[PDB]
Design an enzyme around this catalytic site. Structure first.
Site, PDB file in Angstrom:
ATOM      1  N   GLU A  42      -4.496   4.088 -10.343  1.00  0.00           N
ATOM      2  CA  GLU A  42      -6.303   3.030  -9.899  1.00  0.00           C
ATOM      3  C   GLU A  42      -7.193   2.552 -11.062  1.00  0.00           C
ATOM      4  O   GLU A  42      -7.521   2.305 -11.891  1.00  0.00           O
ATOM      5  CB  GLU A  42      -6.357   3.007  -8.688  1.00  0.00           C
ATOM      6  CG  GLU A  42      -5.543   2.542  -7.979  1.00  0.00           C
ATOM      7  CD  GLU A  42      -5.700   3.186  -6.291  1.00  0.00           C
ATOM      8  OE1 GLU A  42      -6.126   1.402  -6.030  1.00  0.00           O
ATOM      9  OE2 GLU A  42      -5.761   3.442  -5.831  1.00  0.00           O
TER      10      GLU A  42
ATOM     11  N   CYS B 152       0.884  -1.252  -0.004  1.00  0.00           N
ATOM     12  CA  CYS B 152       0.280  -0.037  -0.208  1.00  0.00           C
ATOM     13  C   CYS B 152       0.938   1.266   0.043  1.00  0.00           C
ATOM     14  O   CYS B 152       1.651   1.477   1.070  1.00  0.00           O
ATOM     15  CB  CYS B 152      -0.987   0.197   1.423  1.00  0.00           C
ATOM     16  SG  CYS B 152      -1.988   1.526   1.003  1.00  0.00           S
TER      17      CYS B 152
ATOM     18  N   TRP C 148      -9.444   6.263  -0.306  1.00  0.00           N
ATOM     19  CA  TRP C 148      -9.475   7.136  -2.002  1.00  0.00           C
ATOM     20  C   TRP C 148      -8.704   7.171  -2.626  1.00  0.00           C
ATOM     21  O   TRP C 148      -6.966   6.308  -2.358  1.00  0.00           O
ATOM     22  CB  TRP C 148      -9.419   8.909  -1.249  1.00  0.00           C
ATOM     23  CG  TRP C 148      -8.385   9.591  -0.515  1.00  0.00           C
ATOM     24  CD1 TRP C 148      -6.954   9.464  -1.470  1.00  0.00           C
ATOM     25  CD2 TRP C 148      -8.148   9.183   0.588  1.00  0.00           C
ATOM     26  NE1 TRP C 148      -5.678   9.482  -0.341  1.00  0.00           N
ATOM     27  CE2 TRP C 148      -6.457   9.740   0.580  1.00  0.00           C
ATOM     28  CE3 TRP C 148      -8.285   9.254   2.179  1.00  0.00           C
ATOM     29  CZ2 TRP C 148      -5.642  10.277   2.219  1.00  0.00           C
ATOM     30  CZ3 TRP C 148      -7.658   9.742   3.052  1.00  0.00           C
ATOM     31  CH2 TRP C 148      -6.498  10.231   3.035  1.00  0.00           C
TER      32      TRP C 148
ATOM     33  N   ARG D 106       0.148   4.953   2.918  1.00  0.00           N
ATOM     34  CA  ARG D 106       0.241   4.258   3.973  1.00  0.00           C
ATOM     35  C   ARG D 106       0.990   5.484   5.305  1.00  0.00           C
ATOM     36  O   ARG D 106       0.615   5.472   6.469  1.00  0.00           O
ATOM     37  CB  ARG D 106       1.268   2.933   4.678  1.00  0.00           C
ATOM     38  CG  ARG D 106       0.142   2.048   4.280  1.00  0.00           C
ATOM     39  CD  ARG D 106       1.840   1.044   4.778  1.00  0.00           C
ATOM     40  NE  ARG D 106       2.480   0.985   3.445  1.00  0.00           N
ATOM     41  CZ  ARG D 106       3.268  -0.340   3.726  1.00  0.00           C
ATOM     42  NH1 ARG D 106       3.600  -0.929   4.620  1.00  0.00           N
ATOM     43  NH2 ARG D 106       4.328  -0.182   2.868  1.00  0.00           N
TER      44      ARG D 106
END
Ligand code: HEM
Ligand code: HEM
Ligand SMILES: Cc1cc(N)nc(CCc2cc(CC[C@H]3CCN3C)cc(F)c2F)c1
Ligand SMILES: Cc1cc(N)nc(CCc2cc(CC[C@H]3CCN3C)cc(F)c2F)c1
Ligand SMILES: C[C@H](O)[C@H](O)[C@H]1CNc2nc(N)[nH]c(=O)c2N1
Ligand SMILES: C[C@H](O)[C@H](O)[C@H]1CNc2nc(N)[nH]c(=O)c2N1
Ligand SMILES: [Zn+2]
Lengths: 417, 416
Positions: B292, B115, B287, B118
């Protein structure tokens, strides 16, 4: 034991048995992944003793005679025995021509970080093992550059200088690449030329190079023979094929004054074959477009022309969410491929190269049982997920023969004076 | 053994002592790196926990928890250890204090090596849904999550945690992979309407009751399973599903493509592990990073695959790959996604901003935690990778706990 890799865009699954023939280490453990460490101290090169050399020879010879379908033949047994006695008697041994050729081709074939390996079988192997002086090295290298360039119709080649013996008589090419532009650090802190080459340029300047202090100066070859102090040679400019960079729609792009050389030739790595270490083995192919357009021109630590390209495209350069960098980067790469294609100088875009590697890799799994591949290095540095390698699972393991890193020679060289 | 990671753009070197604490496994060995396998066995978690392996898992989790609150080896530490110890010796499981649940989930995110977002890990809003007993209740909790997280575009991070696993027979599972995903329909002529990644799921929903609008962006229904029964279909109130129509700030024809995406990325099919307990339904959300949606959702071949038409409308030379028309179109599509979200004041981060944030986050983890596990293969954005600073950043990947883990798709497991 078998292993499985799946392509998450095509659902193709391949089975790897070749990793069982792996010897050298990755750097990973069950509790840590070093998959993105630039040089895992395992990937660099400590002169061999007869203790470990013969099993390394034997392993190589077995692979070799397998490939020529002569495993356990008389020629194979006698060659082991021959190399055997030569190691006991001399503490090293010499490769036949045929063995060296197989060695260099397979070092390439085993380069898990190399996307262009579909061509691995057509390497031109120049045996420079009779070379004894830096001048002799300059001559072999000029012939390499001329042969590989081939007026813009590039051919893969490698030139192989005498192997290490006791590590005190090493042959080294001190340039990271045969052809590379100078970098000059100004007193005001800016850099003229390729910032990647500032350190090497100053060695050359200290070694007596009269530096033009231009923005695109080809560096001199700095060549070391038999562990002697390195000497400077100017590659003849008629041999250095260059492409001026223009854009097919942007007429002002030419006015940025950009050019690049045609021939990518790596000269600072180490060729390992049957335990023997070839510390000078310059090799060349042809460029993938992004190596110049994305890395050379657009890395912050390189020419960093992104700003002035975007400036002239009139982009919103104040907020990064305008993607003005992403946009300038694509134009620059469009220009590299256009300039190179227009001049019939071999080059491959990253879509073509990655599709080819996928086909190569599948073919390698069929006829070899695997293809070691470093996903972190195989995925192009732009447009990653729109190339098929992004969705390709890959196993990374270390096969020999191999190319290895080695310390910059200026750090490890006892000077004669 | 006290490892180091280098940044080759800045020469910054960081020393990683945190990996020493790693508990799980990576899939790698000294003889083969699997850093690019999508789902090594280790990243998944019948496999009930015996009373044995449960208390060590609890002790390690409780020890770091009391270390974090400056009360290691203190009265309440030993008592809590003793307390949980006894409940395991008796119930064969145990229950987390609210504070441990919250610390547990925040740190499952802190430890999520794949991720990039983070840096915000400690601002997670935790919703204790452990009193939930039915799919209707699950539905109520998820609606509350979705409304709280969307917050009229001003997105806030959240996780809703449903009752932990007991014997694997009484499993809470959200069958959706994300709380909000567009539908995917086959075709008589073999093509695909909508989102092809959801074709098998969109088929289950219909093959279980859902009446599909068969539009290009039909929000899928929630398919919730409580305590191990058949899953139930629920339609999220549309007024809770904030969507963003996609237009370009330079090309008026872009609106004509008729594209939108939902604002709330909310992963619903993973498994949260805390002190050995397995929370098999834990939908969490934040969000989007622009890419993506624009790089992956729109332009991946096995997805919306719109590059063909975008480039056509840009009048690009689609004859040769070497025109980089896919690249040129890819950059515009991603400019449009960001412009549309920003214009609509829905929260979004670009991949330059988020990778820079992640560098600082690495900085901060190495300075205060001694490390930060990171998976380079997932942190580097799927476009423009090398003009982002994470490209030149070495990262060490190891598996800490508490963690998010994958789990089998329920419709293979569920005794229907
Ligand atoms: C003929 C066309 C070729 C192309 C398009 C190509 C492309 C590439 C690219 C893009 C990389 C990634 C390195 C980077 O981008 O920084 C790479 C790595 C590498 N290539 Fe190839 N290459 C070619 C030929 C060759 C040849 C002839 C050899 C050796 C005989 C070779 C050996 C390697 C090795 C050893 C690496 C690993 C470098 C490292 O570990 O740092 N390649 N190649
Ligand atoms: C707040 C903004 C956030 C952003 C921008 C973000 C971004 C990302 C991205 C880009 C990925 C790569 C996966 C993909 O590309 O499909 C990822 C993976 C992941 N995210 Fe974050 N995320 C955010 C919040 C969160 C939160 C709140 C959680 C959980 C509490 C979380 C947990 C994860 C996990 C577990 C993965 C990787 C799954 C795996 O290990 O395979 N993220 N995230
Ligand atoms: C023969 C050839 C063909 C093509 N197309 N490109 C290349 C350059 C890639 C290349 C690059 C390097 C070193 C780059 C790393 C080390 C510091 N920097 C980040 C080492 C190679 F061995 C190599 F191959 C070579
Ligand atoms: C909360 C949040 C914020 C943002 N911005 N993005 C996401 C999606 C990323 C994401 C994606 C997955 C699985 C996708 C894998 C499986 C097939 N595909 C390659 C699993 C996660 F856990 C996760 F987080 C989530
Ligand atoms: C096979 C390969 O590991 C796979 O395509 C991964 C690579 N990197 C990724 N990175 C992100 N952020 N998201 C992904 O889905 C993937 N897919
Ligand atoms: C930190 C990381 O290892 C480093 O930036 C690597 C990543 N992948 C790469 N991939 C290629 N092709 N070339 C590179 O120089 C690098 N650099
Ligand atoms: Zn690894």
């Amino acid at each position: 034991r078998f292993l499985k890799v799946k392509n998450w865009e095509t659902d193709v699954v391949l089975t790897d048995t070749l990793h069982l023939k792996s010897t050298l280490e990755t750097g990973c453990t069950e509790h840590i992944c070093m998959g993105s460490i630039m040089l895992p101290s395992q990937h660099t090169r400590d002169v061999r003793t007869k203790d470990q050399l013969f099993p390394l020879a034997k392993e190589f010879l077995d692979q070799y005679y397998s490939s020529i379908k002569r495993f356990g033949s008389k020629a194979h047994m006698d060659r082991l025995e021959e190399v055997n006695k030569e190691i006991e008697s001399t503490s090293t041994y010499q490769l036949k021509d045929t063995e060296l050729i197989y060695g260099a081709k397979h070092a390439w074939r085993n380069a898990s970080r190399c996307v262009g390996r579909i061509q691995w079988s057509k390497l031109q192997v120049f045996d420079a093992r009779d070379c004894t002086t830096a001048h002799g090295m300059f001559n072999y290298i000029c012939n390499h550059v001329k042969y590989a360039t081939n007026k813009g119709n590039l051919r893969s080649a490698i030139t192989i200088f005498p192997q290490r013996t006791d590590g005190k008589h090493d042959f080294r090419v001190w340039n990271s690449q045969l052809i590379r532009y100078a970098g000059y650090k100004q007193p005001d802190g800016s850099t003229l030329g390729d910032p990647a080459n500032v350190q090497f340029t100053e060695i050359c300047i200290q070694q007596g190079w009269k530096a033009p202090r231009g923005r695109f100066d080809v560096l001199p070859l700095l060549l070391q023979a038999n562990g002697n102090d390195p000497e400077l040679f100017q590659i003849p400019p008629e041999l250095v094929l260059e492409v001026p960079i223009r854009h097919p729609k942007f007429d002002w792009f030419k006015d940025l004054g950009l050019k690049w050389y045609g021939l990518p030739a790596v000269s600072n790595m180490l060729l390992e074959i049957g335990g023997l270490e070839f510390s000078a083995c310059p090799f060349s192919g042809w460029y993938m477009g992004t190596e110049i357009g994305v890395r050379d021109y657009c890395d912050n630590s390189r020419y960093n022309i992104l700003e002035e390209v975007a400036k002239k495209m009139d982009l919103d350069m104040r907020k990064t969410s305008s993607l003005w960098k992403d946009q300038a980067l694509v134009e620059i790469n469009i220009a590299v491929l256009y300039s190179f294609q227009s001049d019939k100088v071999t080059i491959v875009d990253h879509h073509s190269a990655t599709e080819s590697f996928i086909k190569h890799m599948e073919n390698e799994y069929r006829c070899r049982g695997g293809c070691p591949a470093d996903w972190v290095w195989i995925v192009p540095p732009m447009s990653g997920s729109i190339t098929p390698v992004f969705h390709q699972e890959m196993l990374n393991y270390r096969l020999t023969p191999s190319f290895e890193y080695q310390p910059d020679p200026w750090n490890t060289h006892v000077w004669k004076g």
